[PDB]
């Protein structure tokens, strides 16, 4: 038994953003975050990226990474002294953010306004937030298998997982990566580079005809496969796993089409499933279409319960009911999540943005609704020295691209791809086009039926 006014569940990108949001509005509010992880809230994007590109080993320790412009940066959101302890909190009377790492909420009670930690202790809340994110999908073929194979397989998302992998890559001869996602691909390049240094084999395999095939059009997905390949990666499309066994001391991957890949370690990056274990005890709605907790436009589930981030199935007027997995989204909705908690009764209006880096040399931004199967227009040109994340970082000063681009709304190598529906732009992927995301947002938000989409591209430096 004990009490805190602002309590937030899951200690991630969304929880920390709300934590900052509430503080801003109610200065002197007492905030407590509970987190499964033993780590203090940190951003995630460096884990599949810039953290792999440092030649300093004690950076596997400190997690102080280098950007493409080469300036240090801590992974954790703020230094730890910024927090206040969890016991000292009620007596701080001036408020702060306290962090209960190593604990887990296992019972919610909406009428009773209290959670239950795994160790059985209880905490009463006045205002609660569920920002639990998600657990990466396993691959049912790996589930039927023994604990021996299960062990030789990681599911990349945490820091525990970043260190574990990077460790293995200095140990074995061949790491296979399952998943044609951005993560998958980022990973595969991250490994691909290290490979150019140890000789290790990096295989990437996935059911799609190409990298990010479910998103990008064939011709750009295909181009992307080449870059993955060039970074030293034996890449295997149209791959569908049948079984994973152990023979010759190694891991054997059998494919539905007969092929057989033999390897040392599997890292699987094939989706996220949203953490909704709390919904059963408390009794909130989940979405069977999109997954995760059903909230309204004010990201609200029931009185004194808001949800945000990757677990957030929210309504969005200029689009409809949704659930997205952006970092940008987690920052914003979290913020909004804390804004609403302190009686701000406000809608969600942001257009969340995604981004991916494959190395310092190639970057994709995306926003809106992007699917390969929708009608597509893409305009393309030869890229200039600026058209890559290295420059975009040297300029803006940051590596987290949703920062460089703000959340406002104003021989080929770069271009923009419009995703249409009825001569009207509904999604956008930008390839190596930087600091033009507000123009991306504007176009989508307006919704005009351009009888020529070239002109629209003249807006991204494309001539
Ligand atoms: C390697 C990697 C890279 C990415 N790169 C990019 C990128 O480059 N660009 C981009 O736009 N997006 C990227 N994303 C996606 C983006 O980072 C996520 O959508 C966002 O960070 C989600 O944050 P969240 O806090 O909502 O979820 P999380 O960050 O998962 O926070 C959830 C936390 O809640 C805890 N938790 C869950 N259930 C309970 C419980 N019952 N009790 C207590 N604690 C609980 C978990 O332990 C976890 O620590 C990336 C994701 C990963 C994994």
> Residue 456: CB partners within 8 Å, gap ≥ 6?
416, 418, 425, 443, 450
Q: For residues 122 and 300, is the Cβ–Cβ distance under 8 A?
A: no
Q: Name the residue with tokens 């038994």.
A: 1
Q: 262 and 366: one domain?
A: no
Q: 16 and 124: one domain?
A: yes
HSE-up (13 A, CA, CB side) for residue 4: 26
What CATH number does the domain containing 332 carry?
3.50.50.60
Of 194, 154, 223, the residue nearest 362 (C-alpha): 223
CA 419 to chain CA centroid, Å, is: 22
Q: Tell me the pairing of strands 312-313 and 293-294.
A: parallel
Strand, helix or coil for residue 34: strand
Q: How far is it, in rounded angstroms, from Cα 413 to Cα 213?
A: 19
Residues annotated within the binding site for FAD are: 10-14, 36-37, 44, 49, 105, 157, 310, 326-327, 355
Q: 2 and 106: one domain?
A: yes
One DSSP character per residue, 121-155 reads -EEEEEEEEE---EEE---HHHHHS-HHHHHTEE-
Boundary of a domain, candidates 348, 378, 396 = 348
Q: Name the residue with tokens 């597509």.
A: 376
Strand, helix or coil for residue 348: coil
Q: Name the residue with tokens 């205002």.
A: 127
- Region of 8 please: left (phi>0), alpha (psi -120 to 50) or beta: beta
Q: For residues 166 and 190, is the Cβ–Cβ distance under 8 A?
A: no
> Residue 29: CB partners within 8 Å, gap ≥ 6?
5, 6, 22, 23, 95, 342
Q: For residues 35 and 103, is the Cβ–Cβ distance under 8 A?
A: yes
Q: How far is it, in rounded angstroms, from Cα 287 to Cα 300?
A: 14
Q: How far is it, in rounded angstroms, from Cα 293 to Cα 315?
A: 11
Sign of the CA dihedral with 371 first, then 202, 238, and 415 last: positive
- Token code pair at residue 263: 């390897």
Q: 377 and 361: one domain?
A: yes
Task: Name the E strands within 228-345.
Answer: 233-236, 241-247, 250-255, 260-263, 265-268, 272-274, 293-294, 300-302, 305-307, 312-313
Q: 189 and 67: one domain?
A: yes
End-to-end CA distance of the chain: 66
Give the residue numbers spanning the domain of 15: 1-41+84-133+275-348
Q: 30 and 125: one domain?
A: yes
Q: For residues 342 and 25, is the Cβ–Cβ distance under 8 A?
A: yes
CB count, 10 Å around CB of 8?
34
Of 216, 188, 163, 190, the residue nearest 354 (C-alpha): 216
Q: 438 and 379: one domain?
A: yes
Q: 304 and 236: one domain?
A: no
Q: Which of 7, 104, 133 to mutate to test the pocket of ligand 1 (most atoms within 8 A of CB)?
A: 133
Q: For residues 224 and 210, is the Cβ–Cβ distance under 8 A?
A: yes
Separation in Å, CA 185 to CA 58, 98, 143? 25, 36, 23
For the CA of 15, the closest atom of ligand 1 is 25
CA 13 to chain CA centroid, Å, is: 10
Q: For residues 443 and 458, is the Cβ–Cβ distance under 8 A?
A: no
> Residue 79: CB partners within 8 Å, gap ≥ 6?
none
Separation in Å, CA 257 to CA 55, 128, 181? 40, 49, 21
Q: Which long-range contacts (CB under 8 A, 24 or more apart) does 187-190 make?
A: 187/48, 187/156, 187/267, 187/269, 188/228, 188/231, 188/233, 188/235, 189/227, 189/228, 189/231, 189/233, 189/358, 189/359, 190/48, 190/49, 190/52, 190/53
> Residue 203: CB partners within 8 Å, gap ≥ 6?
174, 175, 176, 177, 233, 234, 235, 236, 261, 263
Q: How far is it, in rounded angstroms, from Cα 50 to Cα 291?
A: 30
Q: How far is it, in rounded angstroms, from Cα 239 to Cα 255?
A: 6
CB count, 10 Å around CB of 358?
23
Q: Which of 45, 177, 212 to mutate to test the pocket of ligand 1 (most atoms within 8 A of CB)?
A: 45
Of 181, 240, 243, the residue nearest 207 (C-alpha): 240
Bridge partners (DSSP) listed for residue 105: 117
Number of domains in the chain: 3
How was this one solved? X-ray
Strand, helix or coil for residue 306: strand
For the CA of 106, the closest atom of ligand 1 is 41
Task: Name the E strands within 10-121.
Answer: 30-35, 64-66, 72-74, 96-101, 105-109, 114-117
Boundary of a domain, candidates 287, 313, 348 = 348
Burial 259-296, CB ≥16 within 10 A → b, else e: eebebbbbbbbbebebbbebbeebebeebeeebbbbbe
What CATH number does the domain containing 445 carry?
3.30.390.30
């Amino acid at each position: 038994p004990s009490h805190v006014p602002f309590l937030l569940i899951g200690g991630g990108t969304a929880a920390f953003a709300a934590a900052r949001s509430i503080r801003a509005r109610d200065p002197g509010a007492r905030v407590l975050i509970v987190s499964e992880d033993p780590e203090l809230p940190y951003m995630r994007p460096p884990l599949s990226k810039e953290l792999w590109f440092s030649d300093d080993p004690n950076v596997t320790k400190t997690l102080q990474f280098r950007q493409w412009n080469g300036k240090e940066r801590s992974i954790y959101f703020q230094p730890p002294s910024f927090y206040v302890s969890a016991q000292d909190l009620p007596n701080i009377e001036n408020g702060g953010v306290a962090v209960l790492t190593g604990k887990k909420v296992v019972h919610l009670d909406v009428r009773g306004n209290m959670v239950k930690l795994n160790d059985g202790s209880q905490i009463t809340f006045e205002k609660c937030l569920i920002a639990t994110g998600g657990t990466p999908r396993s691959l049912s073929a790996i589930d039927r298998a023994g604990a021996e194979v299960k062990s030789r397989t990681t599911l990349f998302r945490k820091i525990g997982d970043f260190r574990a992998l990077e460790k293995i890559s200095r140990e074995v001869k061949s790491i296979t990566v399952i998943g044609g996602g951005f993560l998958g691909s980022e990973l595969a390049c991250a490994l691909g580079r290290k490979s150019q240094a140890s000789g290790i084999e990096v295989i990437q395999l996935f059911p799609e005809k190409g990298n990010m095939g479910k998103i990008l059009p064939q011709y750009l997905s295909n181009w992307t496969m080449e870059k993955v390949k060039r970074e030293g990666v034996k890449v295997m499309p149209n791959a569908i796993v049948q079984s994973v066994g152990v023979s010759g001391g190694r891991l054997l991957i059998k494919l539905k089409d007969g092929r057989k890949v033999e390897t040392d370690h599997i890292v699987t990056a094939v989706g996220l499933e949203p953490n909704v274990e709390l919904a059963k005890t408390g009794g909130l709605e989940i979405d069977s279409d999109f997954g995760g907790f059903r909230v309204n436009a004010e990201l609200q589930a029931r009185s004194n319960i808001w949800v945000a981030g990757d677990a957030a199935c929210f309504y969005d007027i200029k689009l409809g009911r949704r659930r997205v997995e952006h970092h940008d989204h987690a920052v914003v909705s979290g913020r909004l999540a804390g804004e609403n908690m302190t009686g701000a009764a406000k809608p969600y209006w942001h257009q969340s943005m995604f981004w991916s880096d494959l190395g310092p040399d190639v970057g994709y931004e995306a926003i809106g609704l992007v699917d390969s199967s929708l009608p597509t227009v893409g305009v393309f040109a030869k890229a200039t020295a600026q058209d890559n994340p290295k420059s975009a970082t040297e300029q803006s000063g940051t590596g987290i691209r949703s920062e460089s681009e703000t959340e406002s709304e104003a021989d080929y190598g770069k271009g923009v791809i419009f995703y249409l529906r009825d001569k009207v732009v509904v999604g956008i992927v930008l390839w190596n086009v930087f600091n033009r995301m507000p123009i991306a947002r504007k176009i989508i938000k307006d919704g005009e039926q351009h009888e020529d989409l070239n002109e629209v591209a003249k807006l991204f430096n494309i001539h």
